Design a protein around this ligand. Structure first.
Ligand code: IX5
Ligand code: MG
Ligand code: ZN
Length: 313
């Protein structure tokens, strides 16, 4: 009970900031996560032994892929920690519990391929889950790990609290399907501007948590430029492998997945910032003003991609 995780001074300070990078020492990531649960949620939220066993089983079920890996999981959980810590009173006890777990689990057993590639390949998961294919799988894997002996970190919740937390996690994980973000953000945009947004309306909170999930998932664009740019290499390493696999099925991939079109990456990042990232962080900042640093970091990175196109780097 009296057993805190404590980080070295630079991490203790920087972990609080939106732009924190969890570093290249994989063995410190579990401790960074527990640290974040303890401060976000409490030292009482989870039995440490169960939580540690849960974390290590989650890690084992992430694959050695360039981007959708264990580092991504922990990175996405840290962005959520930063949102929760900057919005202390807006979220329920259960939400703080569910959302860090949801972020840690949101890409469980990812293979580095899009929903589209699974459908074109005719992967068995595409028959089991006709939309949000990988995301229904990520939630399935989360429930599987929760049911391993000694891994039920939620065991102390009442039956209805348990049903609620697993429903928060399910919705949060499904919301990371970017195909769903566009309409979620539009509805939030309309609701905020017509002034109908109501955080006591469960369907509204669901929407706001979905947008938080998109914001955490895309958070490479909110890092300092050298982190953003080096993370982009990992993202493209997967896209280009998928593109290669599309060419093996006899399908020209979209340019973003064609390694022969590497030259077009900077212009493609611009469209991404303008169509996805900037809108995401703008609506998030309208709803949750203290998340503004994410939008400011995203705008700085957009300006850095503009500099790449102008050959200024
Ligand atoms: C939209 N677009 C078009 C082009 C392009 C490139 C070369 C030639 C021509 C076009 N490049 C993009 C960038 O796509 C993209 N998708 C992301 N998603 C999240 C994780 O997986 C799926 C989706 C993320 C996440 N973080 N970042 C930076 C991302 N960038
Ligand atoms: Mg995903
Ligand atoms: Zn993700």
């Amino acid at each position: 009970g009296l057993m805190q995780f404590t980080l070295p001074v630079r991490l203790c300070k920087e972990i609080e900031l939106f732009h924190f990078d969890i570093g290249p020492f994989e063995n410190m990531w579990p401790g960074i996560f527990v640290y974040m649960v303890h401060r976000s949620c409490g030292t009482s939220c989870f039995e440490l032994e169960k939580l540690c066993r849960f974390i290590m089983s989650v890690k084992k079920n992430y694959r050695r892929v360039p981007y959708h890996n264990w580092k991504h999981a922990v990175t996405v959980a840290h962005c959520m920690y930063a949102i929760l810590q900057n919005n202390h009173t807006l979220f329920t006890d259960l939400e703080r519990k569910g959302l860090l777990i949801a972020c840690l689990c949101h890409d469980l057993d990812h293979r580095g391929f899009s929903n589209s590639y699974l459908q074109k390949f005719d992967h068995p998961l595409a028959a089991l889950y006709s939309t949000s294919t990988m995301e229904q799988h990520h939630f399935s894997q989360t429930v599987s790990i929760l049911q391993l002996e000694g891994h039920n970190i939620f065991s102390t919740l009442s039956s209805s609290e348990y049903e609620q937390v697993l429903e928060i996690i399910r919705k949060a994980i499904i919301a990371t399907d970017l195909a769903l973000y566009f309409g979620n953000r539009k509805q939030l945009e309309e609701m905020y501007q017509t002034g109908s947004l109501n955080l006591n309306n469960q369907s509204h909170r669901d929407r706001v948590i979905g947008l938080m999930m998109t914001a955490c998932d895309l958070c490479s664009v909110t890092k300092l430029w050298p982190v953003t740019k080096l993370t982009a290499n990992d993202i493209y390493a997967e896209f280009w492998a998928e593109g290669d696999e599309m060419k093996k099925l006899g399908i020209q991939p979209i340019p973003m997945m064609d390694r022969d079109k590497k030259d077009e990456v900077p212009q493609g990042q611009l469209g991404f910032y303008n169509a996805v990232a900037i809108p995401c962080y703008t609506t998030l900042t309208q709803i949750l003003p203290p998340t503004e640093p994410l939008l400011k970091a995203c705008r700085d990175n957009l300006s850095q991609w503009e500099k790449v196109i102008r050959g200024e780097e």
